[PDB]
Amino acid sequence: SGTVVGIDLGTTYSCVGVFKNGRVEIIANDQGNRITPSYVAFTPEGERLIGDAAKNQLTSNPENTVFDAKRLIGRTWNDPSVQQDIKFLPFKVVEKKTKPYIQVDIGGGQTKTFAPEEISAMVLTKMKETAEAYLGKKVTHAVVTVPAYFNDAQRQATKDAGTIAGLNVMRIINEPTAAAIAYGLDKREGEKNILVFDLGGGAFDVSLLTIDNGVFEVVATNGDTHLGGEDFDQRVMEHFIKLYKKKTGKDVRKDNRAVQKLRREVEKAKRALSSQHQARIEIESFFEGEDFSETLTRAKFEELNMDLFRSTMKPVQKVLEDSDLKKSDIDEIVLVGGSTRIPKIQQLVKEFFNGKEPSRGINPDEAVAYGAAVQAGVLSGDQDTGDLVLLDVCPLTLGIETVGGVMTKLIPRNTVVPTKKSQIFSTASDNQPTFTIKVYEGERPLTKDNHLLGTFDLTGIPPAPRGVPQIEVTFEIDVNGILRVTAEDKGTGNKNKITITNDQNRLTPEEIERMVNDAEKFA
Amino acid sequence: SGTVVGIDLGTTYSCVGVFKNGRVEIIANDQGNRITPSYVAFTPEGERLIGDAAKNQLTSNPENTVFDAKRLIGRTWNDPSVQQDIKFLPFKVVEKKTKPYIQVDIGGGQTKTFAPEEISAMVLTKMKETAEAYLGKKVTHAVVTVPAYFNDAQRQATKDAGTIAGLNVMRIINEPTAAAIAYGLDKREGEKNILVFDLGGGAFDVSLLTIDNGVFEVVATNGDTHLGGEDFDQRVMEHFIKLYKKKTGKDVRKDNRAVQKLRREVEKAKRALSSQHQARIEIESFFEGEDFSETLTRAKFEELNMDLFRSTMKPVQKVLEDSDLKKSDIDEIVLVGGSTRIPKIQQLVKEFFNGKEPSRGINPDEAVAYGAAVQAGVLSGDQDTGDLVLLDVCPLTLGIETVGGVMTKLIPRNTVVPTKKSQIFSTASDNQPTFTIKVYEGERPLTKDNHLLGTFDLTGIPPAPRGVPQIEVTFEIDVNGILRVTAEDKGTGNKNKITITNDQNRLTPEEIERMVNDAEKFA
C-alpha cells in the first residue's frame, strides 16, 4: 500500500526510515537530524513548534512545551503511573471523563486541552513530513513501534495518533522486536535467545525475546521507566551549574538561555566522550558579559553517573531470572539507544556476559526505526500481483511391469496433464506370441511394491528373435484425468488398450502421501 | 435407564407399553387384557384385588371397592371437585390434615385410610408386574401420562404413586401429547393444529395442541369430567333392568351377581355394535332359575345415548373458540378412548369437521400408553455412550493468488489439522525470474474478496519457457495451529518461506461467519 515508512515514536526522540531500492534509509529532518525530539510547543504569539525548535526553547516556556506524551498515551487518569508522572511534568495535566489531557495556552491566553495521542499525532505529522520531503511523494502508510509492555489501549491510542497524522498504521510492532529485525535475527534457524538492552533518552527497557522457527516471543521485560541519557546529561548540568556559581557567584538556573546553551554543549560533550577522553565546553556570551570554558573528562563523566550506569545491570539479572536463563543461554545481545554508545555502558554489558560481543553495524538511536522500515518494506508487497500458474500434474509415476517384476515408467510423477507418453518394448523370448501389459502407479522400483491399476494382453505377435519386434506402449491422460493405455505392434498395426477410471480401486490421499515419501529415490 | 415403560394411568382403565426392538408393544395382563381396570378391592377375608378381579366384584362389595382415585389425586379436601365427587363415590372419603383419604375395611373389621396416590400406586404396581411378566426383567423406570389440566400437586402426587410402586417416573407427560406422539405428529415440519378428542371410560377431554418446529403447546382444553363410555353402559343397563322387570316382575338392581353379569354382557354388546347393527345378550342362570335373552340394535343403543353423544360437540366448539381457530385450521384429528370406536361418535366428529378423516392405525384405548412408550424409548437412550470424535479442522480455505487475481486453494476449509498440502506452480512468462506468493484466507474465487495473511518472493528462477519450471508451494499447519508456507524451485532447491501467526491481522469470529456463508459455492 503506497510508500510505507517505519517510525520509532520514542519517549524523547522519534526516527523515520524507509526501505527503498533494496536498502533502509533513515531520513534526516529539515534541520539535518536523523532523530527528532518528541516535543511540541506553543509560543505566546500562537506559533506551533514541533521537534528541534520545540525542545530548543523549553527553558523559557516550561508551561506550554509538551514532551513525554508517551508516558500518558492510552492510560486512565487514576493509573498510578500517571499520578507519579504529573508530579514532575512542568505542563498542566488534567482529568476529562477519567482520561489525562494536556492543558496549554496555544497563544494570547487561549487555553486548549490535548489528548496525549493528539500531541503524538503532531510528532508523527513531523516524521511523515520528514519522509515526504525525502521521497517527494505523499506518505500514507506506516509501521509504528511501541514498548513490548504496552497494553491494547496504549497500542490503539498510538494507532489513533497515526490516524490523526494522516497515516494508515498497518501494524504496531514491539520496539525490541523491531531492533532484532533490524539485525536480521528473524532469519536465524533454530531457537535463539535475544537480550535487547535499550537505554534511551528517558527510559531503560531490557527485553528477553525468543526467535523459534519464524515466531518471536517476548518472554520477559524489565528496566527503569525513568532512567535514560537525559539523567546523565542532568548529572553533568548539576556539576557545571555548581562549578560556575563557585567560580563566579552567578546562579545560572533561573536564566533559561544560559541553561539551554549549557544543555546543548553538555549533550555534544557526552557524545565526544564516547569517542575521546576529554571534551571542551565553550559558550561565548554565556551569562551577562562572560563566556563559559570548562573541560569534562570521561573519568569525571563516569564518576558523576557511575551509580546510574551500575543500576542498569539489575534489570538484566531480573529478566534472565524471570526467563529462567543462564548468561551462556543468551545467543545475541542487541544494544538500542544513544546511551549504549557510552564506553562504560558497553564495558558493564560485555563484562556482565563474560566478554560476549553485542550486535554491531546499526546506529543504536536508529535500530528500532530501521526494523520498522524493514517490516514496512515487507507490507508494501501487499499491493503486488501473484504471477504463479497452477499446474495440473499426475500425482504418482505411472508405468508397466517389464521382465523381473520391474516398474518401467511411462508418465513420471509431476508430469503436466493432459499428456501422451510412449516407449518401445519388445519380446523377452524368440517368437514370443503374446504380451501381458500390467499398468502400475507408484514410485517403487519393483511393481510388487506399487499399485496395480489393470492388465490387458496384446496377442498375435509374429515370430521374430527376442528383442526384434517393436511394440509401442502409450499412456494418455485426457482433459478429464482418464488414463488410457495402448499397446501396438508397429510391424502389423495389431493394437489393444485399457481405459482406467477413478471409480474403483483408487488410492486414498493417505496412501498417496506414503507412496510420495519414496519419490526421488531413483530417477 | 434400564427397561423404561410407558403407562397410561387412566381414570377407569390403565395401559402399559414398551418400545422393544424397533416397535411399541402394548402388554396384555395375566387375564390377557391390554387394558386393566384402575380398581382396587379388599374382600371381607382380607384379600387385595387389583384390576379385573377388583372390578368384577364391585356390586357385592360397594364400600371396600376403590376406583376413580384419579379424581382425588393431588387435591385438597375442600376442592369443590372433591366435594362434588364424594357425593356419588360409594366408598368413604374423609379429611386428614386438609387432604382426602379413602377409608376401607381391609379384612375382618380393620379400618385403613389410603391416600389417593397409594391406591394409584397399587394400580401402577399391577401395570409394572404386567410389563415384568412380558419382559422377564425388573421394570424400574417409567413415563406416566396425566391430563393436560393437571396442576403441579396432581403431577407430583402421580409421581409419588409411581415411586411407591417401585418406579422411577422419569417424566410426566400430557395425555393428548402422548396420543399425538403415538401418531408421529411431533415429526411434522411447520406449524400444525391438532384436535385431540378423548372420550374415555369416565371422562371426556378435548385438547387443542400446536406442534411448531419441535415444540408442543396445549393451547386450550375443554370436555366433561363426568361423561364417558360407562355412562353409555349405564343407559343400556337402565333400559334392560326396566325391560326385565316389565317381562318378569323381578327387580335385578339389589342382586349384585345379576347386575355384574348384565354390565359384563352390556359392555361386549356395546363393542359388537361398533362392528355390526345388532347384538344378542344371553345370560344362563341370570336371576333365580331363569335365563336372560334380549337383542340390542345399534339404533336402540344410539337412541338411548343420542343426547350424551350430541353433547360431545359443544366442548369441541369451545376449544376452537378459546384457540381462536376455524374448523379448516385443524390439520389433524386424533381419536382417543374406546368410545371413539362408536360409529355415531365417529360420524358426529367427521360431520363437525365437514368430512375430514381422523388419524387411524392405533387402538384408541392404547394410543396414550403407545405415545408414553415411544417417549420411554427415547429416554432409555440416556444410558448410551457418545461415540463421536471432535475433529480439529481449518475454519477457512487457505491458498495463494495465481494469475488474474485467482484464489488457488492449498488447504480446503474443514481439512483436518495438523496438515501439510502441496501443489506445483510455474511461470506465467518465458524466463520469468521471480514469484510473488500471496497467502489468502477465504472462500471467494478472486483474492480481492479474501483476507491477505502475508507475502514473500522466490527469486533466482532459472530461464525456461513459461509453464516449464516446477515450484512446489507447501502449506503446513503445525500442532500449535501456526501456518508456514514454503515455495521451492524443484529444479534448483532454491527455497523461501513465511511463518503466519494468530497475533496481528486475524479475522474476528463475526468476519469468519460472513466468509463461511460463501463456502460450498465453488469446489
Side-chain angles (χ1 to χ4, degrees), chain A residues 28-58 60-249 251 253 255 258-259 261-279 281-283 286-296:
Chain A
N29 65 19
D30 52 19
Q31 309 289 289
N33 302 315
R34 287 153 74 85
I35 62 177
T36 296
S38 304
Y39 277 67
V40 176
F42 311 80
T43 72
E45 315 175 347
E47 200 188 4
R48 297 152 172 276
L49 308 177
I50 304 174
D52 291 298
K55 184 163 194 192
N56 299 337
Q57 58 82 79
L58 154 78
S60 56
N61 183 30
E63 290 191 312
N64 306 302
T65 305
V66 185
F67 61 91
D68 271 10
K70 188 167 174 182
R71 291 185 185 284
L72 303 178
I73 196 165
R75 293 180 186 271
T76 62
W77 169 253
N78 285 122
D79 185 335
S81 183
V82 171
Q83 291 301 312
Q84 269 308 108
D85 286 346
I86 61 184
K87 290 183 192 180
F88 41 75
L89 293 170
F91 49 85
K92 197 167 170 142
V93 183
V94 298
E95 183 186 31
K96 300 295 193 187
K97 296 167 153 73
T98 78
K99 298 162 67 166
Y101 285 78
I102 295 143
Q103 189 183 123
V104 294
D105 180 349
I106 64 159
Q110 199 171 355
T111 299
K112 295 302 177 179
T113 53
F114 296 85
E117 64 267 27
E118 290 176 321
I119 296 297
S120 291
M122 296 176 186
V123 170
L124 288 176
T125 296
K126 179 68 174 175
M127 304 317 293
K128 172 176 128 81
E129 287 174 351
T130 293
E132 285 178 346
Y134 174 81
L135 292 172
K137 319 155 53 186
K138 297 308 283 187
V139 172
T140 52
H141 288 77
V143 174
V144 179
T145 56
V146 296
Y149 59 78
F150 264 26
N151 65 25
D152 283 347
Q154 289 174 297
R155 290 171 194 265
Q156 181 62 48
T158 300
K159 269 204 188 64
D160 288 352
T163 306
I164 294 164
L167 300 168
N168 178 340
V169 182
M170 302 186 74
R171 290 298 190 294
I172 294 286
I173 73 169
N174 293 324
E175 284 163 16
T177 306
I181 289 163
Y183 278 110
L185 305 185
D186 56 320
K187 295 177 185 317
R188 290 273 175 284
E189 302 280 336
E191 311 198 31
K192 301 298 171 203
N193 300 308
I194 305 157
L195 193 286
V196 186
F197 185 103
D198 180 357
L199 188 56
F204 172 49
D205 290 305
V206 178
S207 308
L208 195 292
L209 310 198
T210 62
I211 179 67
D212 175 5
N213 196 16
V215 180
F216 276 116
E217 192 188 327
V218 184
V219 171
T221 67
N222 210 293
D224 184 341
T225 53
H226 292 80
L227 176 62
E230 285 184 346
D231 298 307
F232 315 142
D233 293 346
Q234 189 60 29
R235 288 294 181 78
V236 173
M237 288 295 283
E238 223 69 72
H239 168 73
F240 278 126
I241 284 165
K242 288 176 219 142
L243 186 62
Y244 196 70
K245 180 146 190 277
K246 180 200 280 279
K247 291 172 65 148
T248 78
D251 194 57
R253 19 201 59 205
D255 185 297
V259 174
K261 290 175 168 171
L262 185 55
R263 195 209 99 239
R264 212 72 187 270
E265 291 307 292
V266 153
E267 290 175 5
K268 294 162 49 179
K270 182 181 64 180
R271 285 197 286 287
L273 291 179
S274 293
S275 313
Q276 58 189 48
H277 293 252
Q278 48 184 60
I281 298 172
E282 300 167 315
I283 312 170
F286 174 59
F287 194 90
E288 298 169 358
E290 294 310 311
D291 301 325
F292 185 98
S293 166
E294 308 294 350
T295 299
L296 184 54

Side-chain angles (χ1 to χ4, degrees), chain B residues 426-433 461-470 489:
Chain B
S426 193
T427 53
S429 312
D430 294 344
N431 295 346
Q432 180 179 332
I461 308 309
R466 73 192 160 127
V468 173
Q470 294 207 339
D489 182 343

Side-chain angles (χ1 to χ4, degrees), chain B residues 53 137 163 197 258 315 332 359 417 476 520:
Chain B
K137 319 155 53 186
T163 306
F197 185 103
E332 307 287 350
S359 290
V417 297
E476 37 197 318
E520 296 175 290

Side-chain angles (χ1 to χ4, degrees), chain A residues 171 212-215 378 381-382 384-393 413-416 509 513 520, chain B residues 400-403 408 423-428 432 434-436 438 452 455 467 470 484 490 499 501 505:
Chain A
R171 290 298 190 294
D212 175 5
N213 196 16
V215 180
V378 171
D382 292 6
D384 295 351
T385 56
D387 48 9
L388 286 88
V389 179
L390 176 61
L391 293 188
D392 314 311
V393 300
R413 169 171 187 268
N414 288 344
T415 299
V416 169
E513 285 310 296
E520 296 175 290
Chain B
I400 69 166
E401 183 171 308
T402 53
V403 295
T408 291
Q423 292 279 278
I424 309 295
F425 297 83
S426 193
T427 53
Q432 180 179 332
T434 313
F435 290 115
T436 304
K438 303 174 69 189
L452 175 64
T455 75
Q470 294 207 339
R484 281 177 189 92
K490 288 297 290 164
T499 298
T501 60
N505 186 65

Side-chain angles (χ1 to χ4, degrees), chain B residues 457-501 505 507-509:
Chain B
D457 289 347
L458 186 60
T459 66
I461 308 309
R466 73 192 160 127
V468 173
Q470 294 207 339
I471 283 66
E472 189 164 54
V473 176
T474 307
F475 280 44
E476 37 197 318
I477 302 173
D478 72 9
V479 291
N480 295 323
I482 298 163
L483 175 56
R484 281 177 189 92
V485 178
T486 307
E488 177 176 3
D489 182 343
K490 288 297 290 164
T492 65
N494 178 39
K495 195 169 53 163
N496 199 10
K497 63 156 53 204
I498 199 175
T499 298
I500 296 160
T501 60
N505 186 65
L507 291 162
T508 73

